[PDB]
Structure 1
Amino acid sequence: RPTFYRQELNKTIWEVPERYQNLSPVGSGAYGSVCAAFDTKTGLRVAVKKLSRPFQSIIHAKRTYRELRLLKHMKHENVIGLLDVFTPARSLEEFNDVYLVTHLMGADLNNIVKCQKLTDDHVQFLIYQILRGLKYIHSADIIHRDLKPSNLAVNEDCELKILGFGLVATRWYRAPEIMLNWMHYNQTVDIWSVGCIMAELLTGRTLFPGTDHIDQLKLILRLVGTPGAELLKKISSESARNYIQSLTQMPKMNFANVFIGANPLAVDLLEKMLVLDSDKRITAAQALAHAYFAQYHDPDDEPVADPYDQSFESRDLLIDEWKSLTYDEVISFVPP
Structure 2
Amino acid sequence: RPTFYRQELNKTIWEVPERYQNLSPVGGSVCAAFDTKTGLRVAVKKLSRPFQSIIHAKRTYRELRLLKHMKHENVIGLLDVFTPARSLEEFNDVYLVTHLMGADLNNIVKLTDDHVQFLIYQILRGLKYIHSADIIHRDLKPSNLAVNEDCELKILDFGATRWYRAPEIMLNWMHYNQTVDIWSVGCIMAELLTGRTLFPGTDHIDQLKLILRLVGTPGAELLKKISSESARNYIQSLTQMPKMNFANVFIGANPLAVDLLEKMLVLDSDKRITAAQALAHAYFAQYHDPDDEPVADPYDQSFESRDLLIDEWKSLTYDEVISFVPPP
Task: After TM superposition, give the deviation of residue 246 of structure 1 in Å.
Answer: 2.1
Supply the distance in 2 between the matched residues of 1:60 and 1:121 (Cα, whole angstroms): 42
Q: Describe the superposition over 1:15-39 as per-residue Cα deviations: whole angstroms up to 9, x where unpaired.
A: 111101111111xxxxx11111110
Residue 89 of structure 2 aligns to a residue whose secondary structure is helix
Residue 43 of structure 2 aligns to a residue whose secondary structure is strand
Work out the number of aligned pairs and report it: 326
2:136 is the alignment partner of 1:136? no
Task: After TM superposition, give the deviation of residue 288 of structure 1 in Å.
Answer: 0.1
Supply the distance in 2 between the matched residues of 1:13 and 1:211 (Cα, whole angstroms): 37
Q: Describe the superposition over 1:152-195 as per-residue Cα deviations: whole angstroms up to 9, x where unpaired.
A: 111111110000116xx211111111111111121111101100
Q: Describe the superposition over 1:279-298 as per-residue Cα deviations: whole angstroms up to 9, x where unpaired.
A: 11100000000000000000
Residue 78 of structure 1 aligns to a residue whose secondary structure is coil
Q: Describe the superposition over 1:308-334 as per-residue Cα deviations: whole angstroms up to 9, x where unpaired.
A: 000001101110000000000000000
Task: After TM superposition, give the deviation of residue 73 of structure 1 in Å.
Answer: 0.2
Supply the distance in 2 between the matched residues of 1:226 and 1:40 (Cα, whole angstroms): 56
Task: After TM superposition, give the deviation of residue 12 of structure 1 in Å.
Answer: 2.5
2:273 is the alignment partner of 1:301? no
Supply the distance in 2 between the matched residues of 1:90 and 1:39 (Cα, whole angstroms): 22
2:283 is the alignment partner of 1:292? yes
Residue 235 of structure 2 aligns to a residue whose secondary structure is helix
Supply the distance in 2 between the matched residues of 1:226 and 1:177 (Cα, whole angstroms): 12
Supply the distance in 2 between the matched residues of 1:286 and 1:56 (Cα, whole angstroms): 42
Q: Describe the superposition over 1:112-169 as per-residue Cα deviations: whole angstroms up to 9, x where unpaired.
A: 22xxx71101100000000000000000000001011110111111110000116xx2
Which residue does the alignment assign to 1:160? 153
**Structure-to-structure mapping, 1:40-119, within 5 angstroms:** 40-113=36-109, 118-119=111-112
**Structure-to-structure mapping, 1:1-336, within 5 angstroms:** 1-26=1-26, 32-113=28-109, 118-165=111-158, 169-334=160-325, 335-336=327-328
Supply the distance in 1 between the matched residues of 2:315 and 2:125 (Cα, whole angstroms): 34
Task: After TM superposition, give the deviation of residue 237 of structure 1 in Å.
Answer: 1.8
Supply the distance in 1 between the matched residues of 2:93 and 2:169 (Cα, whole angstroms): 34
Task: After TM superposition, give the deviation of residue 102 of structure 1 in Å.
Answer: 0.5
Supply the distance in 1 between the matched residues of 2:122 and 2:13 (Cα, whole angstroms): 37
Supply the distance in 2 between the matched residues of 1:279 and 1:10 (Cα, whole angstroms): 46
* TM-score normalised by length of structure 2: 0.98
Bigger Cα displacement from structure 2, 248-257 vs 289-298: 248-257
Task: After TM superposition, give the deviation of residue 243 of structure 1 in Å.
Answer: 2.1
Residue 5 of structure 2 aligns to a residue whose secondary structure is strand
Q: Describe the superposition over 1:36-95 as per-residue Cα deviations: whole angstroms up to 9, x where unpaired.
A: 111000111111111111111011000000111000000000000100000010010100
Supply the distance in 2 between the matched residues of 1:103 and 1:38 (Cα, whole angstroms): 10
Q: Describe the superposition over 1:220-257 as per-residue Cα deviations: whole angstroms up to 9, x where unpaired.
A: 11001121111111112222212212221111100001
Task: After TM superposition, give the deviation of residue 13 of structure 1 in Å.
Answer: 2.0
Residue 48 of structure 1 aligns to a residue whose secondary structure is strand
Residue 71 of structure 2 aligns to a residue whose secondary structure is coil
Bigger Cα displacement from structure 2, 243-252 vs 86-95: 243-252
Task: After TM superposition, give the deviation of residue 11 of structure 1 in Å.
Answer: 1.9
Residue 47 of structure 1 aligns to a residue whose secondary structure is strand
Give the gaps of 5 or more residues in structure 2: none
Supply the distance in 1 between the matched residues of 2:296 and 2:232 (Cα, whole angstroms): 39
Q: Describe the superposition over 1:245-280 as per-residue Cα deviations: whole angstroms up to 9, x where unpaired.
A: 222111110000110000000000000000111111
Supply the distance in 1 between the matched residues of 2:139 and 2:294 (Cα, whole angstroms): 22
Supply the distance in 2 between the matched residues of 1:330 and 1:194 (Cα, whole angstroms): 33
Supply the distance in 2 between the matched residues of 1:22 and 1:108 (Cα, whole angstroms): 21
Bigger Cα displacement from structure 2, 232-241 vs 209-218: 232-241
Supply the distance in 1 between the matched residues of 2:218 and 2:7 (Cα, whole angstroms): 57
Residue 8 of structure 2 aligns to a residue whose secondary structure is strand
Which residue does the alignment assign to 1:29? none
Supply the distance in 1 between the matched residues of 2:13 and 2:225 (Cα, whole angstroms): 53
* TM-score normalised by length of structure 1: 0.95
Residue 94 of structure 1 aligns to a residue whose secondary structure is coil
Supply the distance in 1 between the matched residues of 2:12 and 2:158 (Cα, whole angstroms): 21
Q: Report % sequence identity.
A: 100
CA RMSD in angstroms comes to: 1.0
Supply the distance in 2 between the matched residues of 1:89 and 1:237 (Cα, whole angstroms): 50
Q: Which runs of 4+ in 1 moved over 6 A?
A: none
